[PDB]
Structure 1
Amino acid sequence: ATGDERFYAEHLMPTLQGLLDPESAHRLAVRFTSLGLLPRARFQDSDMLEVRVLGHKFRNPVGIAAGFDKHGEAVDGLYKMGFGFVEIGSVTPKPQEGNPRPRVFRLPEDQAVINRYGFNSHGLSVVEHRLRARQQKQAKLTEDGLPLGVNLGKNKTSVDAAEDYAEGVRVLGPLADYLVVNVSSPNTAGLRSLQGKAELRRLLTKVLQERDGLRRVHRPAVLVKIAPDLTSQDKEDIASVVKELGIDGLIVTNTTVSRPAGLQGALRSETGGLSGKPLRDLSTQTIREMYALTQGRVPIIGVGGVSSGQDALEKIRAGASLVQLYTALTFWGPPVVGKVKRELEALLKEQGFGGVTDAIGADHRR
């Protein structure tokens, strides 16, 4: 453990979180990050951590999950933190305010957060112009193994969900290495119903037709991000649709509307999605089941409760090609990224893996 990891986790982050309301802490973090006001990322990515998936090289398999940088304000600062890839969003077609404040709640006794932001978004036009200002910088970053994902949502009052996603593909698809069809926010009424078989097949057919209409150098991979709260039937249906349509990958998982037994935080009964440690094993077991249902043929980005190399490797061995985190960054701060990478490299060597690639899905081969 570095001096920075201990100082951030034991002193700086608890002190700052104690002075700030949770949404104010989020906003200040985006500003720090966008200005590059960050501790040194001392960790040097090794060849062991490189992954080739989704038509790209990833210098390391640890990404920032959607929700931290909803509006594409802090992309370059997130690469400076040492993330191997960045996902922005969710972005909605029109700007919208989201839910009334307060709408984010800290459960420090559980190393968890509950949020009900409700897709607060600057909207596609603002984000498009923001990404266009750095489009060639991103092309060089992607060529250097640092890809960009864009996560698409839908407006609260939209009457045609598929048209909202189609608009996102047309506007931000040409600026993305991958797009995410987010059908799993717990905080937009009716959205998770889009995970059902008939609704998902119709929606994803339209999204893929729009993506296929983009010029080759502007044609991203398309992933579907799913909930941790699906029935067995829902998961079988999603696997069937993904294989039928040739969806490029899955992001597994969004936050949970469940409240696992044992939560201690005073705010455990707030409405919204739960993230962090209580989600971890529910997410890992969703990865495991989606990998099996897709015969290991569909790349998975694993997300939910990653705060250590062990957490990352458990998702990789369950079937994830890449992992993301967000909630751990709220407790540990920026040094968590190098921590996870250093611990993951050490565990791969301890378990006899030549690299990340060799470990993907390894549990299924035991």
Structure 2
Amino acid sequence: MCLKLNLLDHVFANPFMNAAGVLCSTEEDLRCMTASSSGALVSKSCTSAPRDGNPEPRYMAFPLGSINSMGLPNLGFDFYLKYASDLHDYSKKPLFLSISGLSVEENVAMVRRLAPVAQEKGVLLELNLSCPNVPGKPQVAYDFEAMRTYLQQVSLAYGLPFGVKMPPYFDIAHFDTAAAVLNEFPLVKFVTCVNSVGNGLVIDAESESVVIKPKQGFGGLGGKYILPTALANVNAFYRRCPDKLVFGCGGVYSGEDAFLHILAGASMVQVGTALQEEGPGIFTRLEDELLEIMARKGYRTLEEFRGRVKTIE
């Protein structure tokens, strides 16, 4: 029985990795994720220049999940590029680098510099088209013309296989249109579904207050709140992008939740809120728990059940 995968010309011990943004902003965080049992890791979404992000409190967690408006705090592209070029031990596991420029121009400037490092070292680009937490900057992937422009310009400037981090959609016509946009771009080899469910609002009854300071308390939701939304978008894109990989993200706390993602079509399975709350020991637990489910069902590999969710009638 086996959790190994081979995709995008890399080998993975298992499908689990962090979700972008969680346990991946500093050199310390990246070494920690590397030292963990995860199959891979992804760096914090970066901008050309360092950012402090939004004021605190900007993340909070609860039984059912998390709310965040971090504001894209990061050490800047130069640092994550250096990590990829000089510091990361690729003998341990594959590295993804998340880029989240605030304009098409900033993304193109970054990917131009990334390309030689991707060629040399095999770092993989995840292009973030879904941040929901920087004031005055709606999600790029909710404007399909903007999305197309970003992908055209990035494809042209980068010229190498990459993937995209997508927001959740909630309308079949939006699935149809977004997947069709993506399918215009052959270099988009993977689609990560989903970013946080945007602009929710958690309120504390005792204090009568919102629980995060930025944006009058509005922030992206993760965790148990979003699992069926996540599974829906995984499956929607799995069905609509038969020539691409889909990576699942949203609501993973157990091997069973990972199993659902995989049934829905996920290749890699990313872990955000639960990893933030539990720490990197979660990866051994998720591995054991997925293996257990597979043993009980007689499944020997992930491809025996990936995308094999049954519909009724």
TM-score of the superposed pair, with normalisation by structure 1: 0.75
Offset of residue 194 of structure 1? 4.0
Alpha-carbon distance between aligned partners in 1 of 2:106 and 2:170, rounded to the nearest angstrom: 23
Q: Which residue pairs with 2:183 in the alignment?
A: 243
User: Quick check: which one's strand share is greater?
Assistant: 2
Q: List aligned pairs for 1:70-81, cutoff 5 A.
A: 70-81=25-36
CA shift digits 1:57-83 (9 cap, x unpaired): 111101011102134543232122211
2:233 alignment partner in structure 1: 286
1:66 matched to 2:23? The reply is no
Shift of 1:324: 0.7
Stretches of structure 1 lacking an aligned partner (at least 5 in a row)? 1-46, 156-160, 213-218
Counterpart of 1:243 in structure 2: which amino acid? N
Answer yes or no: is 1:359 the counterpart of 2:305: yes
Paired residue for 1:167, among 101, 105, 109? 109
Counterpart contact for 1:288–1:319, Cα < 8 Å: yes
Query: Is 1:131 the equivalent of 2:77?
Result: no
SS in 1 for 2:197: coil
Question: What amino acid is aligned across from residue 56 of structure 2 in structure 1?
Answer: R
Question: What is residue 200 of structure 1 aligned with on the other side?
Answer: 147
Q: Is the 8 A contact 2:199 2:218 kept in 1?
A: no
CA contact (8 A) 2:200 2:219 kept: no
The within-5 A match list for 1:233-312 is 233-246=173-186, 247-257=188-198, 259=200, 267=210, 270-295=217-242, 297-312=243-258
Could you say which structure has the higher helix fraction?
1
1:168 partner letter: M
Question: How far, CA to CA, are the matches of 1:193 and 1:129 in structure 2?
Answer: 27
Where in structure 2 are there 5+ consecutive unaligned residues? none
The C-alpha deviation readout for 1:257-298, integer Å capped at 9, x for no partner, is 2659xx886557831111111111110111111111223x31
Please name the residue that 1:185 is paired with: 131
Return 64-73 or 283-292, whichever deviates more: 64-73
Hey, what's the Cα distance between the residues in 1 that align with 2:211 and 2:173?
A: 28
Q: Tell me the amino acid that sits aligned with residue 86 of structure 1.
A: L
Tell me which moved more, 327-336 or 53-62. 327-336
How many residue pairs are counted as aligned between the two chains?
297
**Secondary structure at the counterpart of residue 48 of structure 1:** coil
| Alpha-carbon distance, 1:365 to partner | 8.0
TM-score by length of 2: 0.87
Q: Which runs of 4+ in 1 moved over 3 A?
A: 263-269
Q: Which amino acid aligns with 1:358?
A: E
Q: CA deviation at 1:317?
A: 0.2
| Cα-to-partner distance string for 1:35-76 (whole Å, 9 max, x where unaligned) | xxxxxxxxxxxx610011222111110101110213454323
Contact 1:149–1:179 under 8 Å retained in 2: yes
Partner SS for 2:32: helix
Q: CA deviation at 1:191?
A: 3.9
**1:48 corresponds to 2:2:** yes
**Aligned twin of 2:162:** 222
Contact 1:48 1:355 in 2 (8 A): yes
Please state how far the C-alpha of 1:301 moved relative to its aligned partner: 0.8
Q: Report deviation, 1:309.
A: 0.5
Deviation for aligned residue 1:133: 2.8
Amino acid at match of 1:241: V
Q: Share of identical aligned residues, percent? A: 25
> Considering only aligned residues, what root-mean-square deviation do their CA atoms show, in Å?
2.3
CA shift for structure 1 position 117: 0.7
